[PDB]
Design a protein around this nucleic acid. Structure first.
Ligand SMILES: [K+]
Ligand SMILES: [K+]
Ligand SMILES: [K+]
Ligand SMILES: [K+]
Ligand SMILES: [K+]
Ligand SMILES: [K+]
Ligand SMILES: [K+]
Ligand SMILES: [Mg+2]
Ligand SMILES: [Mg+2]
Ligand SMILES: [Mg+2]
Ligand SMILES: [Mg+2]
Ligand SMILES: [Mg+2]
Ligand SMILES: [Mg+2]
Ligand SMILES: [Mg+2]
Ligand SMILES: [Mg+2]
Ligand SMILES: [Mg+2]
Ligand SMILES: [Mg+2]
Ligand SMILES: [Mg+2]
Ligand SMILES: [Mg+2]
Ligand SMILES: [Mg+2]
Ligand SMILES: [Mg+2]
Lengths: 257, 35, 66, 101, 64, 59, 92, 237, 300
RNA sequence: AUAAUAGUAAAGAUGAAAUAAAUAAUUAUAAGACUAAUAUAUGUGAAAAUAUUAAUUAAAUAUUAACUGACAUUGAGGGAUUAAAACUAGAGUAGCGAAACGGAUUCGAUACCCGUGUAGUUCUAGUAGUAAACUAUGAAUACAAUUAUUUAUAUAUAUAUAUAUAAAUAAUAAAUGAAAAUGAAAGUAUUCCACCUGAAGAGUACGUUAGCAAUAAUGAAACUCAAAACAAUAGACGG
């Protein structure tokens, strides 16, 4: 059985929500309700099978290449992504419930701001945030996820997913919406991706992708509607990126010590 | 059916009802009902 | 399998099911508790306890037990 | 050559499910090894419940349990029960004495 | 072989006794499946922890 | 094909067995021993099949 | 219903002469075909050219080809290993 | 094998060694075994009830308990031959455990042969943790399968909502079909929706089968050719 | 109690099966329950059976008959391949349809006696559906029934003279009708084969409802294309259709007009090549087989 | 075996040989004996025995119902049946085959092999009551731990299996045993009968009884000796 993880300072979260982003009702929808909804569906889908003993991140990797397990993949991807989003927007990862700590001033580290300049042609963090808000509004028509990811070449770049798209495995990033029209450049990217997946010799037709997320923003209606409303998702993404917990985001960047 | 059977090759039910005044006490009963 | 029954074990059997004999776990628990107390006693007394098992795969359990 | 002996190719029936192993030589050999006349029971009068002794005047049925020369087949070959083998052999011997077999 | 040597040497023995196994050959039989590694390792684990508690109680009485 | 008929009706064996007379007791002994060897071979093949099946499954 | 025949206890379980599949030599079959080809179309007939070319290559270095002409049966090893387990003997 | 005596009396044989002086030092196990005596009866024990179905073992129905006529129309006035045979053996033979659910399980998989193709894991997690409310078929912790139907049927007959087992079984079967149809659609739609957002898959199930069949059909091609050439040479003879 | 727990154990959940593990006849559906073990348990030869499975086994799927035997082995085969046949059918997205247009067996429909007008056809099917019954147990259906039916003589000797006396005095053509109905009316309360073992619908192969369209980035899919293999190079003898091997099922392939020339060229090795097919329809027969009809889509 | 037919010059036998219009082939006729497969003597029968077919007569199984109310077990003496050989009469006599006479083999060959082949082997009516007539194991009853495999009866059903209770056979626990082994007895017990008391002499002598007869039953002692026998062990040896 997959159970909803306990969050630090949960009593505060159920009373005052997440300050500057979500209210108490908004956080109950995104985490206490939706995370319960996802975990229960995952348990029903995976109970009695070998996947029941694996964590959601491992389930999505195991099932990423199986077309008829997409339902399990979607549930595992959503569960992992939601706790990636709830973790970097959380007031404090440490449990100051008995310490009553009200001073958590987290700021981008030097390694993060050095990789931002290197990967974005000298752009500042503030400018990159504006590009992230723009990318979300023009690339994610409906539900999806906004990620700041790091690849095998030490370069930070921006990835957007439609519905439950994993950042780890490029064949399942779901960054192109094929319901609408696509340019020849987008079709080239899809055609090149298909060729890479066909070069793999494995009988499971799986490739190696070492991309890892650094920041996760939930773009689903379960996270913003109640507090911002239809059409105000760009005001929601702005608040999230301005109130990130950088103790978690800094720890996601590999240092090598 | 027993006594009230239509088979050409009947069983002992028919012969028993005859000697027991049943095939006759039912024929009259049916006819009396028809009356 | 009931075909391989050593009838000297009759008193431990709970019944037969699907062509095998089902061991009475109520007795297994009582015997296990008694055996466990003996191991605890010998260990607490400083005795040498040897764990013998020669079926494939048992080594890991045997090594940690020792 | 565009031809293969029937003994070297398996013809998968229609409506049946198959595995990749069904195209191998192991399947061919396995089908030969486990090839028994198990469908005889449904076509074997003497394995149905009839009394073989009622067929003593029907040489055509009895001739299915004798060799080309008229030698009664051993129970190992007929697969009958002891009683039916015993009754069938009596029927054949009686049929021979009457002048029909 | 080991069981008979234990008898000859007056060494008490514990063993898992399956339905085809002779109970009287051991001092303390444990009726149970001896063919599954899970069943064996479950019973062995319980006996091993029981020994550990005895060892910890002996090392504790020495300290105090 | 003709030779196969002879062997499946035991014609050559019967002809040879009819050359000399054998006492009824000796005939009965030979019939008993032959049946035992036939049945013994069937039991042997059954055990070899179990061996091969057990070997295939890794026993 | 098919009669099972159970053996008595035996001192051993062994096949006297285990059967082995001896694959036919590729060079010998090539020679057997060429010889037949000459029997029908005639000796040195242009129809058997390919046969002659193949035979020469098969036999160029070794007249019977370079083959792993070694095969042994293991039935007796397994039969002796598993007999005590599978014979169904009653307990002592 | 004979009931052994020397394995359970190690304490008494050791005590004779110590009392005589043949063994100078008390063994470490000696005190432990003395406090925890071995069981040494090794007896066969009778049993008077089948634990599975509660059937009583060892009860003889006397003729006084059968006053009415039987199915043949005859009264029973004397014990029959079976009643006069001692039945001690039945007291000692391990009872055959039976369950009504076993009959339904065989029925379910005879009616739905392809449910067998859904892999089942026999390895248990913890039987003691199962907190199931069989008012509904779905349960957190276990898959939806034939057993879900059987347990639902038993709950219906146990709550007396239905009287006949067949009616309860049919009711459970339809609940099972509804849940199976919702899952077959969630999987089809999830695949369709993913492809519409640019999901790519290396090998499909159909493709996996084709590749495996090719590997087998390639070895089969070689052997066929080889065995169609040995025949030609052997037949030439 | 231990007995209660045992009845609900995972081993108890598997229905007793002694069907041959090595069957060489015609296979139409799964015969054995596939058992699966997780990778962690496989590393320890643990499958939840009585004994450890030999380490030689690398598959995670098996089928078994007996937990233990007199030969001190488990009777099992390390295969689980009927699951891939079902999943490949699911990938072909062809719903199973009734060629007779019968009601959907998976829906609780309100049926009426339209087909119950054959009361004499099926009431006697109980004694006449004895194709493979013993010569004396089937004969026990003659005396055992005769007594049961003969116990209702008084009831039918009064009802018939009280509800249809004219027929008893005119003709038995209608009396026979009242007899067939009487027994059925007095048998519906009874339980004769109250449990029906016949396969219900698809048998679990597919729970897909017909009607749904397959959306794709290139538009709605109108024809399903599936790779396959032609088994024979000559149409099935006596049949106007060849045989193909598509997704673990043997289908009947109908060609547009002509047979591609690769047939004659390849010959008996035609199965060595993969062709593209279109699955027209899929039906289910009473034997529990799937009647898949295909069409050899050829590049044009 | 005889006859016919065409057709021939060798045939037959053996380790190799030799002794006594054919052999082979196709027809026709006659005679006696025997009973291929199935088949396991499975089974049946007191044993001896019993397997080509049919018929008549006699006997034989399981369960249930009713009935009798210990009427049972065993069985000295006695009675009956009893393979093959043998005998007394009358038939039969193909094949086989003591003996006899021949042919070979051999140093010799009163043998083994070959030929001619009488009694006998067959039937009917009798005599006789003997066999390694053996499971070398008297009959009956109560009882004791398992498995496998068949068979039988019964029960159930979601109809073909499943569940029961007996019998048989196989392998065993325990037990017993000099051991080999026995295994439901060669175990645990009870009841009745037969029989044994070192080897050899001897199943002989004498007598008696029975039989047409051969013989069968019953059945010793003296003298002499310290032997004699069984199971198992390790060797040696084996055409
Ligand atoms: K006999
Ligand atoms: K009295
Ligand atoms: K008396
Ligand atoms: K007497
Ligand atoms: K004569
Ligand atoms: K004898
Ligand atoms: K006696
Ligand atoms: Mg075991
Ligand atoms: Mg002549
Ligand atoms: Mg005969
Ligand atoms: Mg016998
Ligand atoms: Mg007497
Ligand atoms: Mg005379
Ligand atoms: Mg002579
Ligand atoms: Mg006389
Ligand atoms: Mg004499
Ligand atoms: Mg005598
Ligand atoms: Mg005799
Ligand atoms: Mg008597
Ligand atoms: Mg005398
Ligand atoms: Mg001796």
């Amino acid at each position: 059985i997959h159970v909803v993880p306990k969050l630090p300072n949960s009593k505060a979260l159920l009373q005052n929500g997440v300050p500057n982003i979500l209210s108490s009702s908004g956080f109950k929808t995104v985490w206490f309700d939706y995370q319960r909804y996802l975990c229960d569906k995952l348990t029903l889908a995976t109970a009695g099978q070998s996947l029941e003993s694996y964590y959601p991140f491992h389930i999505l990797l195991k099932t990423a290449g199986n077309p008829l397990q997409s339902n399990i993949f979607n549930l595992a991807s959503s569960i992992h992504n939601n706790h990636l989003f709830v973790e970097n927007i959380l007031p404090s990862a440490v449990e100051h419930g008995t310490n009553s700590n009200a001073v958590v001033k987290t700021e981008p580290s030097r390694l993060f701001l050095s990789k931002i300049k290197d990967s974005f042609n000298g752009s500042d963090w503030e400018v990159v945030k504006e590009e992230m808000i723009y990318r979300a509004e023009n690339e994610v028509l409906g539900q999806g996820w906004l990620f700041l990811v790091e690849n095998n070449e030490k370069k930070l770049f921006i990835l957007t997913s439609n519905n439950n798209g994993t950042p780890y495995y490029f064949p399942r990033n779901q960054s192109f919406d094929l319901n609408s029209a696509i340019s020849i450049d987008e079709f080239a990217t899809l055609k090149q991706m298909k060729e890479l997946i066909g070069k793999s010799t494995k009988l499971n037709g799986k490739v190696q992708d070492w991309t890892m997320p650094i920041i996760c923003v939930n773009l689903w209606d379960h996270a913003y509607l109640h507090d911002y409303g239809v059409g105000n998702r760009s005001k929601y993404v702005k608040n999230v990126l301005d109130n990130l917990n950088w103790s978690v985001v800094n720890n996601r960047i590999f240092s090598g010590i | 059916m027993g006594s009230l059977s239509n088979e050409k090759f009947f069983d002992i039910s028919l012969v028993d009802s005859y000697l027991n005044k049943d095939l006759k006490n039912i024929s009259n009963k049916i006819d009396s009902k028809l009356n | 399998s009931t075909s391989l029954w050593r009838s000297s074990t009759q008193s431990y059997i709970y019944g037969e099911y699907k062509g095998i004999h089902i061991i009475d776990l109520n007795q297994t628990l009582s015997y296990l508790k008694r055996a466990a107390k003996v191991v605890e006693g010998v260990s607490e007394s400083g005795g040498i306890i040897l764990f013998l098992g020669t079926r494939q795969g048992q080594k890991r359990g045997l090594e940690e037990a020792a | 050559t565009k031809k293969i002996d029937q003994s070297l190719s398996k013809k998968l029936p229609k409506g049946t499910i198959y595995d990749p192993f069904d195209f191998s030589m192991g399947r061919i050999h396995l089908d030969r090894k486990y090839q028994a006349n198990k469908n005889s029971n449904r076509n074997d009068i003497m394995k149905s419940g009839a009394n073989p002794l009622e067929f003593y005047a029907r040489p055509r049925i009895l001739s299915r349990y004798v060799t080309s020369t008229g030698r009664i087949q051993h129970r190992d070959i007929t697969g009958l029960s002891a009683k039916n083998q015993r009754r069938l052999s009596k029927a054949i011997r009686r049929c021979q004495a009457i002048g029909l077999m | 072989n080991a069981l008979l040597e234990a008898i000859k040497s007056r060494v008490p023995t514990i063993a898992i006794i399956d339905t085809d196994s002779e109970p009287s050959l051991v001092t303390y039989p444990i009726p149970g499946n001896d063919d599954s590694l899970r069943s064996v390792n479950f019973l062995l684990g319980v006996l091993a922890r029981a020994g550990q508690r005895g060892l910890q109680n002996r090392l504790a009485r020495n300290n105090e | 094909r003709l030779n196969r008929i002879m062997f499946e009706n035991n014609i050559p064996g019967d002809k040879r067995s009819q050359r000399f007379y054998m006492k009824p007791g000796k005939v009965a002994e030979l019939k008993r021993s032959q049946r035992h060897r036939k049945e013994f071979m069937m039991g042997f093949k059954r055990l070899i099949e179990i061996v091969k099946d057990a070997k295939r499954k890794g026993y | 219903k098919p009669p099972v025949y159970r053996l008595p206890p035996l001192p051993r379980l062994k096949v006297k002469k285990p059967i082995i599949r001896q694959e036919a030599n590729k060079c010998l079959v090539l020679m057997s075909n060429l010889l037949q080809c000459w029997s029908s179309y005639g000796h040195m007939s242009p129809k058997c050219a390919g046969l002659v070319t193949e035979l020469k290559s098969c036999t160029s270095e070794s007249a019977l080809g370079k083959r792993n002409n070694v095969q042994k049966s293991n039935i007796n090893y397994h039969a002796a290993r598993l007999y005590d387990r599978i014979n169904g003997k009653p307990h002592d | 094998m004979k009931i052994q005596t020397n394995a359970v009396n190690v304490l008494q044989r050791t005590s004779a060694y110590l009392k005589s002086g043949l063994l100078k030092e008390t063994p470490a196990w000696y005190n432990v075994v003395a406090s925890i005596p071995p069981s040494t009866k090794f007896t066969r024990e009778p049993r008077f009830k089948n634990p599975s179905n509660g059937h009583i073992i060892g009860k003889l129905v006397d003729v006084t308990e059968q006053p009415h006529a039987n199915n043949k129309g005859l009264y029973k006035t004397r014990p029959n031959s079976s009643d006069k045979r001692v039945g001690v053996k039945r007291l000692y033979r391990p009872p055959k455990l039976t369950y009504v659910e076993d009959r339904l399980r065989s029925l379910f998989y005879k009616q739905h042969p392809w449910e067998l193709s859904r892999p089942k894991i026999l390895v248990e997690n913890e039987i003691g943790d199962e907190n199931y409310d069989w008012s509904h078929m779905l349960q957190i912790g276990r898959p939806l399968d034939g057993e879900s139907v059987i347990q639902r049927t038993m709950y219906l007959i146990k709550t007396k909502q239905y009287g006949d087992m067949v009616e309860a079984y049919d009711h459970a079967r339809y609940e099972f079909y509804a849940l199976r149809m919702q899952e077959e659609t969630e999987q089809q739609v999830a695949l369709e929706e993913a492809e519409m957002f640019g999901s790519l898959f290396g090998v499909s199930a159909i493709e996996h089968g084709i590749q495996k069949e090719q590997e087998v059909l390639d070895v089969w091609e070689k052997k066929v050719v080889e065995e169609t050439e040995l025949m030609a040479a052997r037949t030439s003879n | 109690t231990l007995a209660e727990l045992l009845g609900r154990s995972r081993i108890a959940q598997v229905a007793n099966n002694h069907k041959p593990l090595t069957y060489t006849g015609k296979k139409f559906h799964p015969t054995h329950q596939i058992i699966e073990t997780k990778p962690s348990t496989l590393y320890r030869q643990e499958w939840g059976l009585k004994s450890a499975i030999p380490s030689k086994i690398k598959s995670r799927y098996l089928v078994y008959n007996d937990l233990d035997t007199l030969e001190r082995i488990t009777t099992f085969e390390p295969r689980g391949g009927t699951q891939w046949n079902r999943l490949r059918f699911q990938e072909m997205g062809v719903p199973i349809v009734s060629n007779i247009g019968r009601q959907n067996p998976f829906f609780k429909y309100i049926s009426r006696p339209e087909d119950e007008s054959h009361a004499k056809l099926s009431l006697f099917k109980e004694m006449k559906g004895d194709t493979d019954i013993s010569p004396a147990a089937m004969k026990k259906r003659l005396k055992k029934i005769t007594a049961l039916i003969r116990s209702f003589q008084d009831e039918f000797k009064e009802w018939l003279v009280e509800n249809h006396p004219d027929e008893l005095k005119l003709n038995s053509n209608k009396l026979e009708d009242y007899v067939v109905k009487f027994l059925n009316k007095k048998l519906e309360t009874k339980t004769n084969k109250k449990f029906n073992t016949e396969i219900i619908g698809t048998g679990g192969l597919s729970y897909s409802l017909p009607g749904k369209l397959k959306n794709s980035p290139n538009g709605v899919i109108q024809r399903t294309v599936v790779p396959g293999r032609i088994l024979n190079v000559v149409k099935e003898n006596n049949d106007n259709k060849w045989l193909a091997a598509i997704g673990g099922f043997v289908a009947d392939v109908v060609f547009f007009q002509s047979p591609p020339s690769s047939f004659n060229s390849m010959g008996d090795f035609i199965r060595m090549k993969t062709f593209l097919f279109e699955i027209l329809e899929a039906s289910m027969e009473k034997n529990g087989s799937v009647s898949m009809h295909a069409r050899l889509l050829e590049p044009q």
